[PDB]
């Protein structure tokens, strides 16, 4: 079991969190952004790529759901169909509304005006959702889920994204404090990621 | 009760209308060409949106909810590896084929860029056509969500300005069988019927 992973990449970070939550020690092969063995199993050369015996999977969502189904404990999705769909919809909304901004900010080719606006929008949006972190210990959940596995890599990166949340976002800042301290999250961090804070 | 706000012209809504028909779930189809009940439950106002006593959108979210909520017939494999393979195929169809469909249909695309996207999609589909000789559904013995994503694109080849070459016979044969199937026929809006 191996995972080709960009140690700087929030999408690779998602899969490293899932692996850590499941207690699965994969061989983590660090690939800098942009090797033959990876292109051999995944002609797209995208990261992360999971290889399980001779099975290659890519797309962080595909890989996270495979790991959640293959290694059932602890479950990272709800049990019933509506709640599961709600979790998958929340992952889609995080991708659409937050990850798009992250990707624009971090792309060296983004024009500065666009980078600045992306930062402003992402800061405002995270501040706006903060009240939802007051009453449940995980994001809209009583248990760590794949939703948190998508959120945490973004929140870890706020300093590198140039975003400081305001004091009124305390519920979200408290969620960060609890979540970043958890064993599985600490285990997920690449060397590059640890150096971001 | 169960309703689906649907764009009768759009291939992402067509995906969900295929799944609803396959599952026989008696859903109310509400055609949209911004109803307040829709904006009430989905502030993005995107289509398709499924609503029940539940509010879901994004075609992949909606399709997997339907497959989990209404088990028969199963539209995904049972075991994790095969399920991951199906999910990855859906992603590749989205990235490589749906991206081209969307580019061709976007009113902002340069006509020369539409011609190029038509070529790229035609060639890619032709390159994969031999895999349709090996199994009666796309890399599967049974209709699946992979087919539900592919059939709306294939139904639209004429309106996309794409004619497959005779070399693509197994894919053409797949289209013949699939378009005649009861559920796919039930999925078609009037607007989609006008497309052929």
UniProtKB/TrEMBL annotation, chain A:
| Origin species | Pseudomonas fluorescens (strain ATCC BAA-477 / NRRL B-23932 / Pf-5)
| Domain GST N-terminal per the UniProt entry, residue ranges | 1-75
Q: Which residues form the GST C-terminal domain?
A: 80-197
Name by which UniProt lists this protein:
Stringent starvation protein A
Q: Which gene encodes it?
A: sspA
PROSITE patterns per UniProt: GST_CTER (PS50405), GST_NTER (PS50404)
**Similarity remark:** Belongs to the GST superfamily. HSP26 family.
Give the record's GO CC terms.
cytoplasm
A Pfam family name for this chain?
A: GST_N_2
């Amino acid at each position: 079991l191996a995972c080709y992973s960009d140690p700087a990449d929030h999408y690779s970070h998602r899969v490293r969190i899932v692996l850590a939550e499941k207690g699965v020690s994969a061989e983590i092969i660090s690939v800098e952004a942009g090797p033959p063995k990876l292109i051999e199993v995944n002609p797209y050369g995208s990261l992360p790529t999971l290889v399980d015996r001779d099975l290659a999977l890519w797309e962080s969502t595909v890989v996270m759901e495979y790991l959640d189904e293959r290694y059932p404990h602890p479950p990272l999705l709800p049990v019933y169909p509506v709640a599961r769909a709600n979790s998958r919809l929340l992952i889609h909304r995080i991708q659409r509304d937050w990850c798009g901004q992250v990707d624009l900010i971090l792309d060296p080719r983004t024009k500065e005006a666009a980078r600045v606006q992306a930062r402003k929008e992402l800061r405002e949006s995270l501040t706006g959702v903060s009240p939802l972190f007051a009453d449940k210990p995980f994001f809209l959940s009583e248990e760590q889920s794949l939703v948190d596995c998508c959120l945490l890599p973004i929140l870890w990166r706020l300093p590198v994204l140039g975003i400081e949340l305001p004091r009124q976002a305390k519920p979200l800042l408290d969620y960060m404090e609890r979540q970043f301290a958890r064993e599985a999250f600490q285990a997920s961090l690449s060397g590059v990621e640890r150096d971001m804070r």
